[PDB]
Design a protein around this ligand. Sequence first.
Ligand SMILES: Nc1ncnc2c1ncn2[C@@H]1O[C@H](COP(=O)(O)OP(=O)(O)OP(=O)(O)O)[C@@H](O)[C@H]1O
Ligand SMILES: Nc1ncnc2c1ncn2[C@@H]1O[C@H](COP(=O)(O)OP(=O)(O)OP(=O)(O)O)[C@@H](O)[C@H]1O
Lengths: 263, 263, 257, 257, 94, 94
Amino acid sequence: VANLVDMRDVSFTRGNRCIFDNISLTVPRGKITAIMGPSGIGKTTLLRLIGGQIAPDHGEILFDGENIPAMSRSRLYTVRKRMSMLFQSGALFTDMNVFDNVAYPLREHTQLPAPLLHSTVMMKLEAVGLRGAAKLMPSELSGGMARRAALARAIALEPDLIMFDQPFVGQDPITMGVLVKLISELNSALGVTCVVVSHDVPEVLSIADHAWILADKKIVAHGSAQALQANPDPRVRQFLDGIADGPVPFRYPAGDYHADLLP
Amino acid sequence: VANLVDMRDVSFTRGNRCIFDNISLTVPRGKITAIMGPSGIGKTTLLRLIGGQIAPDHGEILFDGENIPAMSRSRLYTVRKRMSMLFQSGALFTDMNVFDNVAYPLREHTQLPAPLLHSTVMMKLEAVGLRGAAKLMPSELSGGMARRAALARAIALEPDLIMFDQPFVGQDPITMGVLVKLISELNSALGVTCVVVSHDVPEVLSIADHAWILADKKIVAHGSAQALQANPDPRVRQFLDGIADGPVPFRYPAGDYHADLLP
Amino acid sequence: LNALASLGHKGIKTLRTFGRAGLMLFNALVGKPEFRKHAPLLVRQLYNVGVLSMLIIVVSGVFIGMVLGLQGYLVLTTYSAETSLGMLVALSLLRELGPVVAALLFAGRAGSALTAEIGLMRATEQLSSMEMMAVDPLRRVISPRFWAGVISLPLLTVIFVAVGIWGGSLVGVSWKGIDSGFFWSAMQNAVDWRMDLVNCLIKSVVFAITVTWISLFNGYDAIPTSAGISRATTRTVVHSSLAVLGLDFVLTALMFG
Amino acid sequence: LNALASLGHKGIKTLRTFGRAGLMLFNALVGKPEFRKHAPLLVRQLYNVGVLSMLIIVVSGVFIGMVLGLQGYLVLTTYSAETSLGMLVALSLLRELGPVVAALLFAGRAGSALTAEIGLMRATEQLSSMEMMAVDPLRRVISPRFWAGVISLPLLTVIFVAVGIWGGSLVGVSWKGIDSGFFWSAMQNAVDWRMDLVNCLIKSVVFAITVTWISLFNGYDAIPTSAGISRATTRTVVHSSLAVLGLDFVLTALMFG
Amino acid sequence: SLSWMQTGDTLALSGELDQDVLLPLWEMREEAVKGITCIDLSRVSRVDTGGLALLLHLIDLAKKQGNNVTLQGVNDKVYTLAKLYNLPADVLPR
Amino acid sequence: SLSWMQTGDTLALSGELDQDVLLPLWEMREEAVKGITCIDLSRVSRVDTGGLALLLHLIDLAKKQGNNVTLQGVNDKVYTLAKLYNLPADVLPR
Ligand SMILES: Nc1ncnc2c1ncn2[C@@H]1O[C@H](COP(=O)(O)OP(=O)(O)OP(=O)(O)O)[C@@H](O)[C@H]1O
Ligand SMILES: Nc1ncnc2c1ncn2[C@@H]1O[C@H](COP(=O)(O)OP(=O)(O)OP(=O)(O)O)[C@@H](O)[C@H]1O
């Protein structure tokens, strides 16, 4: 089965909020899947849950037929060589230069000859268009170049699934235009699946193939690109087209205008 | 003259960078002007410079015929009753509730009767659609409701110019759809000018009337809405349409592929 | 020399911060001595720096008196003088450890956490928006905090010496078998008022002027990003801790010279 | 009672943090005793916590010895015994103030700034990305820091007592007119090795186990936003400062009971 | 200036309406209203938010002793602020 | 496995090319190249980035003692990575 990731029926709740009731999603091979919801409820939550940081309270999660929160400590360490992530701020070790950061996990997971290791990480900086920033400390990176360097750090051990923890936020359309161009090649070339999880409708629709809109705790109205462009449901019309007031309220629940301004 | 704000020829440089050489902009009355850019090269810089936080090294800035970095301490305090700002994170005093925050500068700049003051700030929370969040501390505000509360705090002393220090970043299209609806009324009603300064092309063009694209230190290619939609200059085609590589480089300046990967 | 020019940048840089510390504080306490606004505004600040700092002083104050009453009990018995314990821990607390240790812990709790509230208030631009409100914050947000220190720490010392000397009266008198009427008796004619009792305040009130000023200055020129602010907090604790001992050695020279 | 249920949340909550402190530290020091990687990795951490903490100890160490030599000089002259100064500041430093004050300043500089580096490293998710690198950080980033403490502070105390006792030998001998050969002479037969000299280390090495553990735990469960991390720093200084005096009163009972 | 007159059954108002001129007219709240039935909006040049709220208070306590006050002469700036703060019918009818 | 053969003037290669099988073939870098002129790409099933770089090193030091090495038999996965890392002509010609 080409379905790389499949969680059956996950039931979360930290303890007071009850996020994620009856969620379900399939991620097949060769795809660029896309998850989009309100804003600030799933993003770092689901991605550490799908990675094996946070254990669920219900359901089963597949990665080519293996349950994720049932493996050993050592065995789930071994499957981490397959999948990798890319955080919203970019996770770079500050007490290094940008060469050693992108060349870090090669020294932690394989044995390589020193002139060979130096060369094969140098070309991969060209693969993100960041060869010239070769020996800079991760402070003078101006944000835009910071995400691309962690992206080259992400493709290290030939990963087959790369989680994109909101690559698109707070950036310039030239910088958003760069990141859609790079992420288009990395699924076409190398056959890498990527789970982009964000909320940026006119950019994520130019690359997705099977979106999943997580409006409420449910997974309501998921589908392909042009199918969700015509679904007249009031939730998905309000979200994708940016309607000012639909089922999501404009105002807040309050009292009447008779005792609040007339004391 | 209806030109509220006009800086003649401002020459900045903190000391090592030389930002803002030969900048010039006019802001007339009744307008919704809009300033763009590349990615962090003016935003908090120009707005504190236009407010009288940072003094220039050259030029003259007008607010109905008065030079801004030449007033007294007391006189420039008095003109602060006219203009106000709205920060990118939302500036709320944390050790209060949201009622006292929006009702703050009324207690600092005018004498009002206590039941009258309580009522007139209560209705203004309805003016931003935030009456129900009446006595909350500014921690449980979920970001989206945080900017709107500072916006109601912004319209306090009947301001005639409200500086918008990037209202649109990192938010949901429903939340972006709310903020374009509110800011449309506040120029139509009340005749308030507002200087929106951001980089979000498919949202700022739906409201602007005379944009000013600050690509480099110069103010190159400024104009109206549809005029800048057809200007075929390579800078403004790359920025507004999000071209991946134009005059702005794709890669970084580096050496040849002969000694970097062949040691 | 090429390396002596790197010191030439510092010798100018490190003196301009002293210029900023005077210039900020001088603007903080000049003009408009208003009392209608500040009197409820200041008393909320004493809940911040006085009440929350009260518990750590007393629970540490009983441990200093119990240690000095224990350790001092061996040194008197080898010199065979029981009655000297009352004129020892009263002596040692009221002139040496009272002003020095209480100011250390005050730099610990109230010294650091005050600097955090200042730099955070510039980090979210609550400071930079208050200038758009045309209210000068240095008389508005700094001077309620600055007077909240120098009023507090003398009242933090007199609670420290008292609960310190009470715990000293436990382990010597009750547990280590000394008559109660004999212990206070040597302490009665032990210390005078003119060069001992007010002298404890003189050492303590001059510490509060430094620690409150050195704390609230580091919040005012810290780098507003999240990295520079926690750097400034651990720069505040290390700089007050030299200034309390850099002053006390001077202030013990005048009183006992 | 309605208010007694608010304590029922706390009595469970405040004990689970103790469960997290043991469970984090137990995972930090078990399995793979590798030394090829850590030996250059650890020596960079001693530049962080040992070398930068060295200057504050010695410049404060001269001020304690100069004060005790000054203040002690009045108490001996009223009892007319000059020679006792050498067996006083040697006595007082090596068993009371040596372990207690040096551990306070170590909690000041190195205690706080270590906690800042931990919580910041989770705030930018350098911790949460290292799990994607499949390297367990508790043996990788915590145990280089934890051993960097307990090795350091005994070597921070022996530098403190020595430069402390040298400054005490200045103001009494040189300035306040005492023969140099007489001062060390009373100090020679003053203190033994078995219950004094190694006893200074026993008080100091058990402080380093607590302060380093209490610092690096607060970085591991702090709220990763910029507000909660500076809250955790000023929670680290106040919690170590009780634990140094909460231990010292116990550790002065066994040695001198 | 916030000069104002009566007709014996109808409150008149003149001058400008600002948030700095309205405090003496707050002091008249029971001798000001005399069973009023109409409000002129004769010589207003600018209206403010609190001056609207002062206007909103005078009509409201003109209930429960007096009439249901009619409105006239509005310069169509107040109607902009009417639907802006979405004021209901029973506090401001036209 | 990374079994490999020679023809006396042309280096052959067989088995799979991974980043875990390539280190003994790095140990042969001067007895491996013998004035080579061609490289077969005969039985490769997967190519990796470092195995491409090992391939890129063997052609490169086949200069300055030997020939200009011809290329053949590529399974058209390496050509995808060729323009991906935009490799120039003088290090990889076809
Ligand atoms: N144990 C916990 N750990 C982390 N967050 C928690 C926990 N319990 C409750 N929360 C709340 O849930 C939220 C989880 O973080 P969240 O997923 O929002 O991060 P994020 O990257 O901002 O995601 P998004 O961008 O979607 O908001 C936090 O804002 C926090 O207030
Ligand atoms: N004295 C100074 N004060 C503030 N920033 C300074 C100063 N000197 C140099 N800088 C640099 O210039 C920048 C000024 O802030 P900036 O205008 O970038 O904030 P911003 O809101 O991120 O704006 P933008 O979105 O354009 O980046 C800072 O990032 C800082 O690194």
